[PDB]
């Protein structure tokens, strides 16, 4: 859990 | 959100949309796993309404999309309609969300974990930008 | 009022309840808690969704989108169903169904 | 305040 394949970018 | 910014496509890949079944997005809500969703109670979720997970821009007919029905809501009993205190609903899906790129599941906290006033955190949403 | 059609996201900071409070008074209970009045606010439709943080490399949900100021007031602290107080629950749910 |  909580580590997206695409990462954000704040 | 006011005064937020665009996501990077995909990047929250938990992120679903509550839907009515008119199409239109009334809450979000979170993937816990490829069963379950999380959500506010006083969304007032019911079996009538649709999980759409992967979504970016609900503008797009391009996006691959799964709409999942819902099989049961479990509204936390100790939910207080009155005070909107406990504001928490489970969303067991009908059939299981296909976990991807762009849809997985979000951790969970120990109940007695510390998350101090100070930290910077992020939230993320359809919600409206202006009032 | 714009809805817009793309995910929007915002960083923000969380409050501690007793500040919180200076702005919401006795609405505000312990399992709530606060985030915003920072320049950004969650507002109507984000409503069920996500107030995460990032611990150990991996995002966490430590809240979701519950009630705030009427206006979506940028100087206003937004209000959060505390997952903390709410994970049992959550897992007794899932072990019985 | 209204739910959000």
Redesign the interface.
């Known amino acids: 859990?909580?580590?997206?394949?695409?990462?954000?970018?704040? | 959100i006011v005064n937020g910014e665009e996501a990077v496509p995909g990047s929250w890949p938990w992120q679903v949309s509550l839907q009515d079944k008119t199409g239109f997005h009334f809450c979000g809500g979170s993937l816990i796993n490829e069963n379950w969703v999380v959500t506010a109670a006083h969304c007032g979720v019911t079996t009538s309404d649709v999980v759409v997970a992967g979504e970016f821009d609900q503008g797009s007919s391009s996006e691959k999309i799964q709409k999942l029905k819902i099989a049961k809501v479990f509204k936390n009993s100790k939910y207080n309609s009155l005070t909107i205190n406990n504001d928490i609903t489970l969303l067991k899906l009908s059939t299981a969300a296909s976990f991807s790129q762009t849809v997985s599941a979000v951790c969970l906290p120990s109940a007695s974990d510390d998350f101090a006033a100070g930290t910077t955190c992020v939230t993320t949403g359809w919600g409206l930008t202006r009032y | 009022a714009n809805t817009p059609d793309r995910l929007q996201q915002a960083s923000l900071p969380l409050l501690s309840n007793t500040n919180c409070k200076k702005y919401w008074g006795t609405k505000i209970k312990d399992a709530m808690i606060c985030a915003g009045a920072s320049g950004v606010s969650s507002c109507m439709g984000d409503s069920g969704g996500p107030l995460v943080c990032k611990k150990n490399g991996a995002w966490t949900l430590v809240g979701i989108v519950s009630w705030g100021s009427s206006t979506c007031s940028t100087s206003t602290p937004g209000v959060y169903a505390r997952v903390t107080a709410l994970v049992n629950w959550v897992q007794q749910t899932l072990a019985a169904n | 305040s209204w739910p959000w």
Do not use: E
């Not at chain 1, 859990?1 to 704040?10: E, F, M, R, S, T």
């Open positions: 859990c909580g580590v997206p394949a695409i990462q954000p970018v704040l």
